[PDB]
Design a protein around this ligand. Structure first.
Ligand code: HEM
Ligand code: GWM
Length: 405
């Protein structure tokens, strides 16, 4: 290979290539995707931190250029969205993030803990009633929970879980997938639908108020806060995607990785108090996002390597998280790892994940109830888990499990 084993869209096990890259070419120009690929912890954290030099404005630009058909569909369909927050830059970013944070209050979703817990228990019970004692932590638990949670917060109809998963799959594929022009066409139609619904919900809040995040955002604007209807709709476009896709993945990975480390699953059974540190280590070792993008605003350097104004940068947090310079025996999963929260799976700096607490809350509750109700849980077999191809999102498509009668 010419890129040290790195295959940009191959999500099944990228960590040996990350390791090779850190040692051999820590800042590597990859012409196959058009980015400087960055793999060391210190280089990645410094780049996140320096927002004045490295803009996030390309974080939502498609990795593969939008072809003619998709372009026509989305133009004809009134698609005018780009980024609610992640790819905005100051001063717009600063203004809109502050308004989002003030509506997205911690006390608002922690009041959903009992509903989330009851929901988890219901799914576990339904799974255990299966006619073969075989389950899948993705379809039988992780799929629904964060989705219903974020839909409830935003004020969307919870019967639309399957629709939002289709819209979410399409955003993930369109923007970070290796799609042909023809493959972009169904996703384009879905993105059009998605954006129309975001706008519809802002209009509905204007007309009828409500008790949710959308209505709160409209009430802020009504009280004089500077945020337009297009910006509120864009915050919905953001939250109705970012607010569940990666948490579904996280919950899935919690079971995938822990069930593969029986000694540590057993520790969790024995002491449920270890679960939050366990989630920290799953986030380091198996974060939902392994790479995120930046754009150089001027000639600069990363790790001593010259980067041109306008060059794209792919920061591989999945690699940062294994860097021996920051994490001793970094390739090993260890729930007791004291500095696991130094991980960069939520980013760092001005765009740092808005919903990180909500995501950890749901992972914790899932682990608490599943370990309580099915301590004998284990993987169906080895080599039974595949990952969808994507530049940035590392998504196990299933986690087949079984248990004792
Ligand atoms: C479940 C695991 C999650 C992971 C691994 C994750 C990861 C990330 C990452 C890597 C970023 C970009 C960080 C940066 O550019 O510095 C980000 C930003 C963001 N995330 Fe999360 N996220 C998760 C869950 C959530 C949830 C549950 C929500 C909403 C409830 C959320 C909402 C957002 C928003 C709105 C931004 C943009 C913030 C900004 O640009 O100021 N995320 N997240
Ligand atoms: C990780 C992430 C964060 C925000 C997103 O949505 P926008 O804020 O619309 O860019 C998408 C993915």
């Amino acid at each position: 290979t010419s890129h040290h084993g790195y295959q940009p869209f191959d999500m099944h096990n990228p960590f040996p290539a990350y390791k090779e890259l850190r040692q051999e070419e820590p800042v590597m120009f990859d012409e196959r995707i058009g980015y400087w690929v960055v793999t060391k912890y210190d280089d990645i954290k410094t780049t996140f931190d320096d927002w004045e030099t490295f803009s996030s404005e390309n974080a939502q630009a498609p990795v593969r250029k939008r072809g003619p058909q998709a372009t026509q569909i989305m133009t004809d369909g009134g698609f005018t969205a780009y980024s609610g927050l992640s790819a905005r830059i100051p001063p717009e970013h600063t203004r809109i993030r502050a308004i989002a944070q003030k509506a997205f209050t911690p006390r608002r979703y922690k009041a959903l803990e009992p509903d989330i817990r009851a929901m988890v228990i219901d799914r576990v019970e339904k799974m255990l009633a299966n006619d073969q004692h075989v389950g899948d932590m993705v379809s039988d638990l992780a799929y629904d929970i964060p989705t219903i949670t974020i839909l409830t917060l935003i004020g969307a109809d919870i019967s639309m879980v399957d629709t939002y998963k289709r819209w979410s799959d399409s955003r993930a594929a369109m923007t970070w997938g290796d799609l042909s022009d023809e493959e972009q066409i169904p996703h384009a139609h879905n993105l059009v639908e998605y954006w129309q619904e975001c706008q519809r919900m802002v209009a509905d809040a204007h007309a009828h108020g409500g008790d949710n995040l959308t209505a709160d955002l409209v009430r802020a604007q009504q009280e004089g806060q500077e945020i337009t209807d297009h910006e509120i709709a864009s915050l919905l476009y953001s939250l109705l995607f970012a607010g569940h896709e990666t948490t579904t993945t996280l919950i899935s990975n919690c079971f995938r990785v822990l069930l593969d480390h029986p000694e540590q699953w057993q520790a969790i059974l024995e002491n449920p108090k270890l679960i939050p540190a366990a989630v920290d280590e799953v986030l380091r070792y198996s974060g939902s996002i392994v790479g995120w993008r930046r754009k150089a605003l001027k000639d600069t350097e990363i790790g001593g390597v010259a980067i041109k104004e306008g060059d794209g940068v792919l920061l591989l947090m999945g690699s940062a998280n294994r860097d021996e310079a920051r994490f001793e025996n970094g390739e090993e999963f260890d729930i007791s790892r004291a500095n696991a929260r130094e991980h960069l799976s939520f980013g760092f700096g001005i765009h740092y994940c808005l919903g990180n607490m909500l995501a950890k809350l749901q992972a914790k509750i899932c682990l608490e109830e599943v370990t309580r109700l099915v301590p004998s849980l284990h993987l169906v077999a080895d080599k039974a888990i595949g990952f969808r191809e994507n530049l940035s999102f590392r998504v196990p498509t299933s986690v087949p499990v079984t248990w004792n009668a």
